[PDB]
């Protein structure tokens, strides 16, 4: 009753699926290896960090990123799979934004990187829509109740990034210095950028 179905080891099943397709000539030479490299090396939250740092230091770019995220991202050449229609959402002194895909795992891959295990967890998918303040608190981010939390559920083709507020103590920093404090979790919206003490 309620027991798991018998299954071969998952690695055996995944490579069986590869071999069955590959052995029919359906997988071009180097195809999955090409994707592995794209997923590991190119799709990266360092890209979203570069976009945030530019917005923080360039009012004109900030405006473009918030009004036409796709065009802003395209200037850097960072459009891609699961990242073709981009909306950036702006945190403010009274608003914290947070992103989820409650139905699966949808994420702006090219500029955030592939989602981490925790974002795809049933815990995050079930809970952050209903109790984002408690979820963020448990994760290490306290949001004071003078702030509205707004959760974006990625249910169609829009792919989101959070533009967090720029923390005090970073005035005059270079774009490279600002990029360093914009982490993957800041782009998803569960973390606020931290300035060293």
């Amino acid at each position: 009753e309620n027991a798991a179905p018998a299954q071969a080891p998952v690695s055996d099943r995944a490579w069986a699926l590869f071999r069955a397709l590959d052995g029919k000539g359906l997988v071009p030479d180097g195809y999955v290896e090409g994707w592995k490299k794209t997923f590991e090396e190119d799709f990266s939250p360092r890209r979203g960090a570069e976009l945030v740092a530019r917005a923080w230091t360039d009012p004109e770019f900030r405006q473009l990123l918030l009004t036409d995220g796709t065009a802003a991202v395209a200037q850097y050449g960072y459009l891609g799979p699961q990242g073709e229609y981009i909306v950036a959402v702006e945190d403010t002194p009274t608003l914290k934004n947070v992103i989820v895909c409650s139905l699966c795992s949808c994420t702006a891959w090219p500029i955030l990187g592939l989602p981490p295990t925790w974002y795809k967890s049933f815990e995050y998918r079930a809970r952050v829509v209903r109790e984002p303040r408690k979820v963020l608190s448990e994760m290490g981010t306290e949001i004071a109740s003078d702030i509205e939390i707004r959760v974006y559920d990625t249910t169609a083709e829009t792919r989101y990034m959070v533009l967090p507020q720029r923390p005090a103590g970073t005035e005059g920093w270079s774009q490279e210095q600002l990029q360093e404090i914009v982490t993957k979790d800041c782009l998803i919206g569960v973390a606020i950028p931290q300035v060293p003490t």
């Binding site: 071969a8 815990e123 209903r130």
Partner: protein, 211 residues
């Protein structure tokens, strides 16, 4: 489809397994883990065998207990393998022979899907809309927490895409529709039993009606 995958608002889960900025390790934690997405794209882009929406739906079609105990990347191994069998490309025999053991697949669909709705409305930013009080047994990109609920439009997309409830079944009548960022008050969705502010759902035009 009112499946167990429609998790938003479910109560009883524990802590999210993360603290902010913790080390999440490499992109792939095992040598096979890049295969499901890479083979999904082979099926979508190289073979033209199925849509991304069909991949979402075949994972929704995992038997529910199987869905609940299966790690994320493995669900996509199972889902892509199932589609390859359903589309006549592979057999389950050959998958199990190559795997050296059982390779159970998602369950058959119990819906043929539905077409892009014939009658819809172009909505404007600031307009109040209600999510249509409809039940769809096949694929749909409406989480149940917003069914029948009212919110306000914050964005109408400037592009249009095939209706998931049709393309997620490989139908020829998905058309194209824009989607709308619909902002709901947390209380509209969960009454007093929420600590949030607002929730914005990106809803296809065919899921909406004037409020």
């Amino acid at each position: 489809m009112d499946g167990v995958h429609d998790l938003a608002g479910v109560q009883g889960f524990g802590k999210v397994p993360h603290t902010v900025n913790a080390d999440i390790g490499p992109t792939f934690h095992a040598e096979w883990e890049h295969l499901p997405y890479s083979l999904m794209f082979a099926g979508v882009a190289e073979l033209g065998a199925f849509s991304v929406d069909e991949v979402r739906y075949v994972v929704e079609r995992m038997e529910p207990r199987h869905y609940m105990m299966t790690p994320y990347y493995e669900r996509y191994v199972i889902g892509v393998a199932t589609l390859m069998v359903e589309k006549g490309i592979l057999t389950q025999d050959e998958l199990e022979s190559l795997a050296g053991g059982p390779f159970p697949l998602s369950r058959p669909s119990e819906s043929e899907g539905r077409p892009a709705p014939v009658e819809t409305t172009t909505f404007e930013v600031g307009q109040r809309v209600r999510v249509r009080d409809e039940y769809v047994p096949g694929h749909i990109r409406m989480p149940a927490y917003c069914r029948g609920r009212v919110g306000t439009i914050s964005h109408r997309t400037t592009e249009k895409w095939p209706f998931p409830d049709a393309i997620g079944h490989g139908r020829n009548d998905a058309g194209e529709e824009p989607t709308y960022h619909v902002k709901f008050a947390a209380e509209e969705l969960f009454g007093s039993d929420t600590d949030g502010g607002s929730v914005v759902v990106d809803l296809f035009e065919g899921y909406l009606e004037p409020a």
